[PDB]
Design a protein around this motif. Structure first.
Motif, short mmCIF file in Angstrom:
data_model
loop_
_atom_site.label_atom_id
_atom_site.label_comp_id
_atom_site.label_asym_id
_atom_site.label_seq_id
_atom_site.Cartn_x
_atom_site.Cartn_y
_atom_site.Cartn_z
N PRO A 119 4.39 2.45 -0.52
CA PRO A 119 3.78 1.32 0.20
C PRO A 119 2.59 0.73 -0.52
CG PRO A 119 3.31 3.37 1.32
CD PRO A 119 4.36 3.68 0.30
N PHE A 120 1.75 1.58 -1.12
CA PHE A 120 0.58 1.10 -1.83
C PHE A 120 0.96 0.39 -3.13
CE2 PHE A 120 -0.46 4.76 0.73
CZ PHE A 120 -1.53 4.31 1.47
N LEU A 121 1.99 0.87 -3.82
CA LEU A 121 2.46 0.17 -5.02
C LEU A 121 3.01 -1.21 -4.68
CD1 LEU A 121 4.14 3.10 -6.96
CD2 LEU A 121 2.30 1.63 -7.82
N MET A 122 3.82 -1.29 -3.61
CA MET A 122 4.36 -2.58 -3.19
C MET A 122 3.24 -3.53 -2.78
SD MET A 122 7.36 -2.07 -3.95
CE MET A 122 6.84 -0.72 -5.01
N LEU A 123 2.28 -3.02 -2.00
CA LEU A 123 1.14 -3.83 -1.59
C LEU A 123 0.36 -4.31 -2.80
CD1 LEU A 123 -0.35 -2.21 1.63
CD2 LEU A 123 0.48 -4.55 1.33
N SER A 124 0.12 -3.43 -3.77
CA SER A 124 -0.68 -3.80 -4.93
C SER A 124 0.01 -4.89 -5.75
CB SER A 124 -0.96 -2.57 -5.79
OG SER A 124 -1.64 -1.59 -5.05
N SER A 135 -11.28 -10.58 -8.75
CA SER A 135 -11.58 -9.15 -8.71
C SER A 135 -10.51 -8.40 -7.93
CB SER A 135 -12.95 -8.91 -8.09
OG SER A 135 -13.98 -9.15 -9.03
N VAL A 136 -10.04 -8.98 -6.83
CA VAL A 136 -9.01 -8.32 -6.03
C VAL A 136 -7.73 -8.13 -6.85
CG1 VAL A 136 -7.67 -8.42 -3.90
CG2 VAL A 136 -10.01 -9.25 -3.93
N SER A 137 -7.32 -9.16 -7.60
CA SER A 137 -6.10 -9.04 -8.40
C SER A 137 -6.23 -7.96 -9.48
CB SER A 137 -5.76 -10.39 -9.03
OG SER A 137 -5.58 -11.39 -8.05
N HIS A 138 -7.35 -7.97 -10.20
CA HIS A 138 -7.54 -6.96 -11.25
C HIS A 138 -7.57 -5.55 -10.66
CE1 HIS A 138 -8.07 -10.08 -14.18
NE2 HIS A 138 -9.13 -10.58 -13.56
N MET A 139 -8.19 -5.39 -9.49
CA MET A 139 -8.23 -4.08 -8.87
C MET A 139 -6.86 -3.65 -8.36
SD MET A 139 -10.98 -2.84 -9.55
CE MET A 139 -11.08 -3.88 -11.00
N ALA A 140 -6.01 -4.60 -7.97
CA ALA A 140 -4.63 -4.25 -7.64
C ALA A 140 -3.92 -3.66 -8.85
CB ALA A 140 -3.88 -5.47 -7.12
N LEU A 141 -4.14 -4.25 -10.02
CA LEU A 141 -3.61 -3.67 -11.25
C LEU A 141 -4.11 -2.23 -11.45
CD1 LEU A 141 -1.58 -4.66 -13.06
CD2 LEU A 141 -3.27 -5.90 -14.40
N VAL A 142 -5.41 -2.02 -11.23
CA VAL A 142 -5.98 -0.68 -11.40
C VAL A 142 -5.35 0.31 -10.41
CG1 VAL A 142 -8.10 0.66 -11.11
CG2 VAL A 142 -8.12 -1.45 -12.46
N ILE A 143 -5.10 -0.14 -9.18
CA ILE A 143 -4.49 0.73 -8.17
C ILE A 143 -3.09 1.15 -8.60
CG2 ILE A 143 -3.59 0.81 -5.82
CD1 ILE A 143 -5.90 -0.97 -4.98
N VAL A 144 -2.30 0.19 -9.12
CA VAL A 144 -0.97 0.53 -9.61
C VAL A 144 -1.06 1.59 -10.70
CG1 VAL A 144 0.93 -0.35 -11.00
CG2 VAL A 144 0.24 -1.56 -8.94
N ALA A 145 -2.00 1.39 -11.64
CA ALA A 145 -2.15 2.34 -12.74
C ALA A 145 -2.49 3.74 -12.23
CB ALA A 145 -3.23 1.86 -13.71
#
Ligand SMILES: CCCCCCCCCCCCCCCCCC(=O)OC[C@H](COP(=O)([O-])OCC(O)COP(=O)([O-])OC[C@@H](COC(=O)CCCCCCCCCCCCCCCCC)OC(=O)CCCCCCCCCCCCCCCCC)OC(=O)CCCCCCCCCCCCCCCCC
Ligand SMILES: CCCCCCCCCCCCCCCCCC(=O)OC[C@H](COP(=O)([O-])OCC(O)COP(=O)([O-])OC[C@@H](COC(=O)CCCCCCCCCCCCCCCCC)OC(=O)CCCCCCCCCCCCCCCCC)OC(=O)CCCCCCCCCCCCCCCCC
Ligand SMILES: CCCCCCCCCCCCCCCCC[C@@H](O)O[C@H](CO[C@H](O)CCCCCCCCCCCCCCC)COP(=O)(O)OCC[N+](C)(C)C
Ligand SMILES: N[C@@H](Cc1ccc(O)cc1)C(=O)O
Lengths: 57, 458
Positions: free
Chosen positions: B260-265, B290-300
């Motif tokens: 769910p977190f990967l899909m959300l990110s 900032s939100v978009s870049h942090m979504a990338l970080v969350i996926v990583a």
């Protein structure tokens, strides 16, 4: 030859000689439970302190 | 590592004993000296961490974060002294005290060896930020922003605390080295699922995760310039650092708890990049970036590979520098025209050429032009995601197209076109603002020259 007792004589605490043995357990008591043993030994500082979360003392 | 902590605590009375017209000079000089001292933490090993004592340690993940914090303090001081000129001496000293306390809390947070001490410092960072936002913000919305900033955080962190103490009753320790060496797998039960959620949600709301991000535009728009700088550059990275620390005890549950977190990110990265295309406020655009870049970080962080971890570290450092620079650039125009509407002041390249060059370089680093470390982190994360699943290149690819668009859009709206006729109060750029931009941008390219210093322990 009977003499009436004086005032305060019949209320005395006297002694009596009897061959009846003194009962040892007149209450019929059970054996008492044993107590928690004891605290013994010398007191030493707590190992590594309080050990509460991040505190080192 | 008290050789860094004690000088900041000394910054405190040095500020409170300074002469009324020397506070900025002294604070800036000694902040820069502290940053120079903290530069020595970059000497890291290949096998283990620098274990200074029972309480503090330094890894290859936390050392660049500490360097970034100590370097950001003088920049915040330089950016703040313009709009605080009318303030009284005591209130200026209180503002500087808030900044110093925030730096101290962050420094101790990034090096704590135990998870409860880390939690305590990571919550202690809340108070100075909230005070700064709600006391020195400009508009009436700041109050609401403060509330959104507080409870969104605490509603995530209160469960974590419970989980933490529960873990200490089960394993006997919260020391990170012991936790790593004595790691045991997490079985598939409802209790373990809720423990995973309690351990993850606080860091998720800190990043922030898409859907839990509404506090960020409010807080980062309503804050004063130093508040926005420290919120975007360092405080968002607390979530990523905490997640990379905490994931060592969550395997193999993560293998399916991350979906769910990967899909959300991924989808929310697309969504926030799209939102940036239609934004009337210039600060809100940077916040959604900032939100978009942090979504990338969350996926990583969620896919849990060495390449993804290296990419996440590089992206966090690069984003911190770039977003702080962008906020400062927007603040210059705001101080000139007293409005955050993007289309109000146009054609600024004709009036301010060097500031236009700074704008161009900042927007180039935002879209991850190679070989910037922004691009290095983004590419490492994209490669790891491709290994995770070949279809991700679609979504990631779309993101790369949208980002550049809105980035250039911002530039084209502010610097190009014709100047607004009735705006006649645009003064030449001060030396302070140019120096601020240079001190933001030069470390980025210098780090590009030697990228292994920001690639983390992997
Ligand atoms: C004049 C000063 C003087 O005479 O200095 C002598 C004294 C010499 O003592 P030392 O044995 O050489 O110090 C060894 C190391 O400093 C290291 O000493 P240590 O390893 O024995 O540490 C002492 C220990 C126990 O000491 C403490 O708990 C109190 C320390 C204060 C915490 C800092 C908060 C504000 C400052 O500290 C801890 O356990 C760490 C917990 C601290 C977190 C407190 C919780 C609040 C969250 C953060 C806000 O120096 C100091 O006391 C250090 C300055 C304070
Ligand atoms: C590639 C050539 C290599 C040359 C060798 C030496 C290069 C030394 C450069 C040192 C670092 C630059 C300083 C950055 C701040 C900008 C300076 C400034 O504020 O302007 C005042 C100054 C005063 O002039 P002005 O009359 O007052 O006019 C100012 C007006 O505002 C209007 O001024 P403007 O209209 O003249 O524009 C200012 C200029 C300045 O604005 C900038 O864009 C410069 C900043 C670079 C872009 C940052 C984001 C890109 C990410 C890549 C990171 C690369 C860094 C590598 C390591 C650097 C070490 C610190 O922007 C541009 O001219 C167009 C920018 C488009 C660049 C496209 C190239 C992309 C990458 C291509 C290769 C890069 C890697 C090389 C190795 C590859 C494998 C062999 O402006 C200048 O003097 C002209 C700037 C020179 C342009 C440098 C562009 C090429 C250098 C790229 C990186 C250097 C690599 C060196 C390694 C050896 C190769
Ligand atoms: C706005 C954004 C907020 C942040 C997003 C947070 C994301 C949280 C989502 C949680 C992810 C998964 C949680 C639990 C894992 C599986 C959930 C379940 O649907 O899967 C099946 C579970 O089966 C059924 O679905 C039972 C669960 C149904 C009841 C749950 C209520 C979900 C309804 C949606 C409510 C919205 C929740 C979020 C509120 C905001 C699997 O079958 P089973 O193998 O047997 O269960 C595995 C566990 N075992 C092994 C111990 C048995
Ligand atoms: N985690 C990596 C970090 C690194 C990256 C590049 C290097 O050149 C060196 C080190 C190790 O190995």
């Amino acid at each position: 030859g009977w003499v009436r007792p004086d005032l305060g004589e019949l209320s005395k605490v006297t002694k009596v000689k009897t061959d009846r043995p003194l009962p040892e357990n007149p209450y019929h008591s059970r054996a008492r439970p044993e107590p928690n043993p004891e605290a013994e030994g010398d007191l030493k500082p707590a190992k590594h302190g309080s050990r509460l979360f991040f505190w080192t003392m | 590592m008290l050789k860094i902590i004690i000088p900041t605590t000394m910054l405190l009375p040095m500020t409170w004993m300074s002469k009324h017209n020397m506070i900025w000079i002294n604070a800036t000089v000694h902040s820069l000296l502290i940053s120079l001292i903290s530069l020595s933490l970059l000497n890291q090993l290949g096998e283990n961490s620098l274990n200074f004592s029972l309480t503090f340690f330094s890894d290859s993940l936390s050392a660049p974060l500490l360097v970034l914090t100590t370097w950001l303090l003088p920049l915040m001081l330089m950016a703040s002294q313009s709009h605080l000129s009318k303030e009284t001496t005591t209130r200026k000293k209180l503002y500087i005290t808030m900044l110093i306390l925030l730096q101290l809390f962050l420094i101790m947070t990034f090096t704590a060896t135990e998870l409860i001490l880390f939690y305590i410092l990571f919550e202690a960072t809340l108070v100075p930020t909230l005070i700064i936002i709600t006391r020195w913000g400009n508009q009436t919305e700041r109050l609401n922003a403060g509330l959104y900033f507080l409870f969104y955080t605490l509603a995530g962190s209160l469960p974590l605390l419970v989980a933490l103490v529960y873990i200490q009753n089960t394993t006997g320790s919260l020391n990170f080295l012991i936790i790593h060496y004595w790691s045991h797998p997490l079985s598939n039960s409802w209790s373990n699922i809720f423990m995973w959620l309690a351990c993850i949600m606080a860091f998720m709301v800190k990043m922030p995760l898409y859907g839990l991000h509404l506090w960020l535009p409010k807080a980062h728009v309503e804050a004063p310039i130093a508040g926005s700088m420290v919120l975007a550059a360092v405080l968002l990275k607390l979530g990523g650092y905490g997640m990379m620390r905490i994931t060592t005890i969550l395997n193999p549950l993560t293998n399916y708890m991350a979906y769910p977190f990967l899909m959300l990110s991924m989808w929310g990265m697309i969504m926030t990049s799209s939102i940036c295309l239609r934004q009337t406020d210039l600060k809100s655009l940077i916040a959604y970036s900032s939100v978009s870049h942090m979504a990338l970080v969350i996926v990583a962080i969620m896919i849990q590979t060495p390449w993804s971890f290296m990419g996440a570290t590089a992206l966090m450092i690069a984003h911190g520098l770039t977003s702080s620079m962008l906020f400062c650039l927007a603040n210059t125009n705001y101080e000139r025209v007293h409005s955050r509407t993007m289309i109000l002041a146009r054609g600024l390249q004709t009036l301010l050429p060097l500031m236009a060059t700074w704008w161009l370089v900042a927007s180039l680093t935002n879209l991850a032009l190679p070989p910037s470390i922004n691009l290095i982190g983004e590419l490492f994360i994209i490669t790891a995601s491709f290994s995770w699943s070949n279809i991700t290149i679609i979504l990631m690819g779309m993101n790369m197209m949208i980002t550049a668009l809105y980035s250039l859009y911002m530039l084209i709206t502010t610097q190009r076109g014709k100047y607004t006729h009735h705006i006649n109060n645009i003064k030449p750029s001060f030396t302070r603002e140019n120096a601020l931009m240079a001190l933001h941008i030069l470390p980025l390219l210098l780090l590009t020259l030697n990228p292994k210093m920001i690639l983390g322990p992997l």
